[PDB]
Amino acid sequence: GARNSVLRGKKADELERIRLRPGGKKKYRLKHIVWAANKLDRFGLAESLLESKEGCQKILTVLDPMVPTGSENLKSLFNTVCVIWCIHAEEKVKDTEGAKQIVRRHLVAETGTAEKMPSTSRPTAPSSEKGGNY
Numbered sequence: 220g221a222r223n224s225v226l227r228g229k230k231a232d233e234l235e236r237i238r239l240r241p242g243g244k245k246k247y248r249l250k251h252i253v254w255a256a257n258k259l260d261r262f263g264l265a266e267s268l269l270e271s272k273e274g275c276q277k278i279l280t281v282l283d284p285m286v287p288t289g290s291e292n293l294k295s296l297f298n299t300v301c302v303i304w305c306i307h308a309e310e311k312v313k314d315t316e317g318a319k320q321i322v323r324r325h326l327v328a329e330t331g332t333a334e335k336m337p338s339t340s341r342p343t344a345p346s347s348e349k350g351g352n353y
Contacts (some may be wrong), residue, residue, distance in 0.1 A: 238314040239251075275300055
């Protein structure tokens with residue numbers, strides 16, 4: 220053994236508790252934490268940011284808008300972070316699907332006012348066009 224870092228003895232329990240899928244019978248394991256920490260360093264993000272809940276917020280915010288506009292390889296790295304942050308924020312989650320709902324919930328709640336947008340006014344796009352004929 221080499222002590223812990225990302226998850227302590229108590230936190231470890233929560234990890235083995237969370238189920239990989241909503242209708243499955245498998246739970247998360249250390250192996251899954253590694254793949255995530257690695258994908259980060261590689262992509263460009265740190266790995267020690269998975270210890271603190273705050274740091275995880277910076278990883279979920281980036282992968283958030285990338286979820287829809289990101290390959291599957293980016294989807295797995297996101298679903299994992301959502302769980303890690305939940306464990307640290309002290310949020311009870313049955314499965315991944317539940318961990319995400321809780322995460323996004325905390326963002327949307329703020330987005331409601333962050334994206335209040337201006338008054339009623341249609342977008343007046345500028346005039347532009349191309350051409351290439353006789």
